[PDB]
Design a protein around this ligand. Structure first.
Ligand code: K
Ligand code: K
Ligand code: K
Lengths: 534, 534, 534, 83
């Protein structure tokens, strides 16, 4: 009639029933007399070194209250929404007995962000010595303004250790420098309850937690400008892109989408017009084909004929030794800064073999094209030899990004004078000590078999997910993903609300690329991102 | 000296301690009774249709014992090596006192391969009717020879539902099967106990369930054979594909991967050869490129010229009204059943810009080709003019699947004899009362503006996830997903371990395509699925 | 609503009543026990040998525990999936007074790979001298680690006989062909008890018990290479076959199936070729037909004419019963070695009585052929008088195999290089002092009336069941089937996982062929089998 | 101590007042367990129980009639047995 979450007429196992005489035997083999073991045994969280060079007032440990301080709880929070109560944080240390040095400990209240200075000690502090023997506990209370917390709450109580009085090795010279360590462990406490069970596969209203922007492995990675696989990271102080740069508001200023499909267009050439103006057929913005690239011609030019290079007046390369041995590759070609576009080129009557295309954003001037770094319905440009004879053709077409022809140039995307915004160029400088990065992609070339580099603001999959999946990120904060090469050299990437990646070191160097990417958590953009290199 | 897993001298939160009076107020917000909520209610598991046709001695439901029957446990089984105890599985029949048809319920001991036969009822069977008021329970016990199971064990108790009196309803039809569905829900049971805690790392993370095999919309969908979108579902009692047809064993007969990238090959010529034997530059199988397609030529033919099609076998025609205004179409062309790839067509020292290519598999004999379907490193075929005079060329190339040539044809992937398989062709037939399907996907044609209809066995996104993630399913079941056209109608789809989609209706027809998809559960393979049309 | 397993409305005996004064009357005439009577005597089980050639330390009879040791229990165990408890045993010898010699009987615990030596006797050993008239009783307890066992478990306690002192017959030290038969008999202890009804018609997962691999008559036996009936057996050190040879993983290296049906192919030839190449219609492996033979020509040849058989290299063409006088019948023919097949030449314009096949596998270089050690779709041979001319005359042929042509050759199968293998050739040697075998049927010749011998690795019914059904056997074990002639002369066949048979002697002689069979258990591979013959 | 499936029938519409739907002399053969054990004996004695279930949950009108005929007779396909 009206049945409840447990109501149901029982019948029992038909041949047997659950024999509780049995299950004790399992409890007899093991020590299983109690559930929720994690409430009664400590757990590693991190460890610290403390040495004589680390002076007074330094902050060693700094962690905020939360479930993440014991990974069991990090695993159970996925079921639930909320949490309330305290945490314990064991401290253990072993010094020689000849050493000295006293070491502090402070719970701070929420809303603050501590500072490596003694003014932090103008506050109730507990000390302990490096001669300490029995470990120490420091129950961290929950000092909150609300009845409970969600999992996306950083404004919490927190803890710090700091070097009250420095370390002393009497036997040591001042040149050589030793140092003990400090091991930290945690435990949930006693008043620590979660709350508000979540029905899977729900979608948390403010948004989910970003942990799928970057695929872990590498082979799943391609850039948001050209389909070729990542190979290396590139630092710049400034970054900028609009074609597929989707922010956490799931929008942009671009025109394109995160799918590298062909590009259907139509084109209405009259007399012998190799070129024309291709018009939109599929899009999200009116008058712009989806997936269209973002790069102008460098300079004005006349699309006329075939490739041309040089070796400074004028010994043209036709091999590798000249090219790789050449000084400059000045590229006298007359269709320089365009893509290559596989070019189906259908129409009624063109019983031909569909010659190949070249494109850019630019205004035509009656035979030629002028650069213009803003797209409209008009800038779309072509050069593909539609086999025209003053017999007006009106060909349908469909293309595919393959390479580039501006040989000798720098890697694409480092010149905002060229890049094709509409009105807004999304952009960041740096933030804190953390610097931006592009992602590199080798792209193909037309005449010389070599390949040039590309710059990418985002992996595609990083942009696909943001077209769809509304996430949380306070704009002052980052989504911290951690990288590990085959060797073990790691560094942390940060990702902003806008979408532009960030990193906390001035260079990388070389590394075994079959690298992976793991999740860490949220971190504040006002802080540097870590790195262990070499 | 020693310190135990809990020992450590306390000092407490120095500014304040945790107040239980606070944490109670959290419980005052919620209705927090006790942790381990999952031991006090039920959870959805699946839902099984039961049409008129299910003659008795035919099974509906079959599930072994284990924690995977309740995801709250599935999330905790990663923390404990071992488990033990019972499990209650609720049942509830749709059709509120309207229908007839008893339905059995058997627990079998471990170590069996049950059979759709009445001999299974030569055993203690419980029956219940389709006029059931209160849902039904059937507490499964844990019968075993060892004290505690592991997570990997399978030799366990298992429940089955089987038919005992075929139903009755005058309110259904032969095509659609709206009506009976048998909801199943679970609950751990009193004696259920995990055992033998483990640290995370290890967190093996296997048990991946089908939930992302299809998106929740159409516009993401694309056939594995060709990049264009879906627009219709097609039935055929047989089914066949090999290029990208992946199974839950994460393998195939397919030389290719699920990525529509281009195809790089280094063709070579001597004097004037248009055609040559393309060779790999990227692959997973030796010799064959990735993304290389599967459709042979129909016949022997000497590719030597341009397009030509003629109506009536007495004419030549180059316009739409003449195209449709046609007795038949003839295709007097020399590259008939071929493709339209882009062909960047590079080389060292070779101007005379890139042209278009045409590719299939075929065996080449000195000026021509013939259809072979058993692809090897020799069967590759091209017809691009790389401008070769009297000398080897060493023409590197890249190619992206972009069209077709065989006008006059009206579908692809329907003649299995022309399909390219390495050695084996995956294939199925009808099952239960369910039948296979294809996913239609329009495609380009070349000289003529029209298109033609492809058959596809798999969405790419389906085939991508199978390439990677070890999804779980028995050999004789589906991973059912639902479909809802935007007229409100719906039908279900099943996915066997092989990857072939399956359906239960006899027809589809036209439908409001802007549709959705969702996951209902697991269903035994040998049963008619559900449906409702118009 | 629900009806439970034992829920109904008892109206009962309408005319009468199931009384109780009567049932006890039947009891007192026949007597009773506690619902069972096979727990009070010693069933007969088997009998084995003990001859002079079995020296000290050697073994005769290892069977593990299980209900197979009592034919009342092997019967019942088809109702249950489980068991637990011991056995009582009685063995004895039917020896003369002169036949001195001593014997042993040990229960070895589980998890042992015992040895045909004497070190086992340091375990508690029972004795039984041949002179000892009266039998002996002892027990076999179920020393196990689990709460119980399953029928698919074969890692239990096990009995072993061992020759504590060898046999002696002081009289006939000429032939050494003595007897001393042993017998074994079983009674279960009251501790014995089954568990866990198996739902009838249900199989097991680990696999069934092999007790239907061989029929119970020679009349139902035929070879896995030719349809003829068995006549006699053969021993060889090396044994091998690939055509219809299946293993207990339901696999094979073959191309064929366990049938003997007409083959159907499709010639396509011209110019009076008479040497076509057959393509496939039905198969399991592509290219190769099903039921196609496993034999290559001896050597190269050129088919034009017809038969020829001559006495020697200096003389006549025997063509009569005066041919045995040759002893070196040399077969100087047009062709040799082929297998004959009937035919049905269906070609649309061949209004003539169709004509015989003369096929094999071989390479067609030219109008001649050459040997094909290996099979492929190009290595299929025919020599028909297919009624053709200049013009192509395609036809279906519908072959069916009858006999053989390689007069004078030895029994087929010996010639390894003539035998066909795709890639792999299953092969064995001696094994634990046993010998492998073939099975000898006959096959018929072309010209003379006579019949040459043929070898076979399996009976056909042994091969149908293994393609289909999932039997159980560990690799270090056999399936012991006892073979009996019309006399009481008998022996035992073991069968490994691969399907190759084995025997524990080096000869058979001849015997009353109306023979039978019976399953007897699971003996190791190390161990010698029985032989009670002459 | 429970019930075991034996067989199944079709009491369709075109069957009338006097047909027989089921007729089996007594023996082990009314239970496929016992039949597997009659191979181990040459005798039996005692009643057997039976159970029916009709599939007309509340719909199908129409009833049946049962008789326990004695040993020696061989019943017929008429109404007279209902005397
Ligand atoms: K064209
Ligand atoms: K070129
Ligand atoms: K004929």
């Amino acid at each position: 009639s009206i049945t409840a979450p447990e109501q149901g007429t029982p019948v029992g196992g038909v041949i047997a029933e659950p024999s509780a005489q049995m299950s004790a035997a399992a409890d007899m083999a093991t020590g299983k007399s109690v559930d929720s073991e994690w409430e009664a045994f400590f757990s590693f969280h991190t460890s610290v070194n403390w040495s004589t060079s680390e002076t007074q007032g330094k902050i060693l440990f700094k962690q905020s209250l939360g479930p993440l301080l014991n990974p069991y709880l990090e695993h159970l929070a996925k079921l639930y929404v909320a949490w309330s109560g305290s945490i314990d944080v064991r401290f253990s240390i072993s010094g020689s007995g000849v050493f000295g040095g006293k070491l502090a400990a402070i719970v701070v209240p929420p809303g603050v962000d501590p500072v490596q200075s003694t003014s932090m000690l103008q506050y109730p502090h507990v000390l302990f010595d490096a001669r300490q023997v029995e470990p120490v506990i420091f129950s961290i209370p929950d000092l909150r303004s609300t009845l409970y917390h969600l999992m996306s709450d950083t404004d919490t109580t927190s803890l710090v250790i700091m070097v009250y009085n420095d370390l002393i090795n009497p036997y040591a010279n001042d040149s050589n420098s030793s140092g003990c360590i400090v091991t930290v462990e945690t435990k949930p406490g006693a008043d620590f309850k979660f709350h508000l069970l979540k029905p899977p596969g729900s979608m948390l209203t403010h948004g989910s937690v970003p942990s799928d922007l970057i695929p872990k492995s590498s082979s799943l990675w391609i850039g948001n400008r050209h389909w070729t696989d990542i190979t290396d990271f590139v630092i710049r102080p400034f970054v900028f892109q609009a074609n597929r740069h989707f922010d956490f508001n799931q929008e942009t200023a671009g025109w394109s989408t995160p799918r590298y499909r062909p590009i259907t267009i139509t084109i209405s050439e009259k007399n012998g017009a190799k070129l024309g103006i291709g018009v939109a057929t599929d899009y999200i913005v009116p008058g712009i084909p989806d997936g269209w690239p973002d790069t102008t011609i460098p300079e004005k030019l006349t699309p006329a004929g075939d490739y041309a290079i040089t070796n400074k007046s004028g010994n043209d390369i036709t091999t590798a030794a000249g090219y790789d041995g050449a000084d400059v590759i000045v590229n006298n070609t007359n269709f320089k800064g365009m893509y290559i576009c596989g070019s189906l080129q259908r129409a009624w009557g063109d019983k031909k073999i569909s010659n190949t295309a070249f494109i850019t954003t630019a205004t035509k001037v009656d035979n030629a094209i002028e650069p213009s770094n803003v797209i409209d319905m008009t800038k779309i440009a072509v050069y593909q030899d539609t086999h025209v004879g003053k017999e007006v053709q009106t060909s349908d077409d469909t293309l595919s990004l393959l390479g580039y022809t501006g040989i000798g140039e720098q890697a694409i995307g480092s010149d905002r004078d060229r890049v094709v915004r509409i009105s807004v160029l999304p952009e960041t400088g740096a933030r804190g000590g953390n610097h931006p990065i592009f992602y590199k992609n080798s792209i193909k070339l037309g005449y010389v078999i070599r390949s040039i580099d590309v710059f990418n603001s985002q992996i595609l999959h990083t942009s696909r997910q943001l077209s769809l999946n509304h996430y949380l990120l306070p704009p002052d904060s980052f989504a911290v993903y951690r990288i590990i090469d085959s060797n073990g050299s790691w560094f942390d990437i940060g990702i902003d609300s806008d979408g532009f990646s960030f990193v906390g070191v001035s260079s990388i160097g070389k590394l075994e690329f079959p690298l992976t990417a793991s999740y860490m958590g949220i971190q504040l953009a006002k802080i540097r991102l870590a790195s262990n290199i070499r």
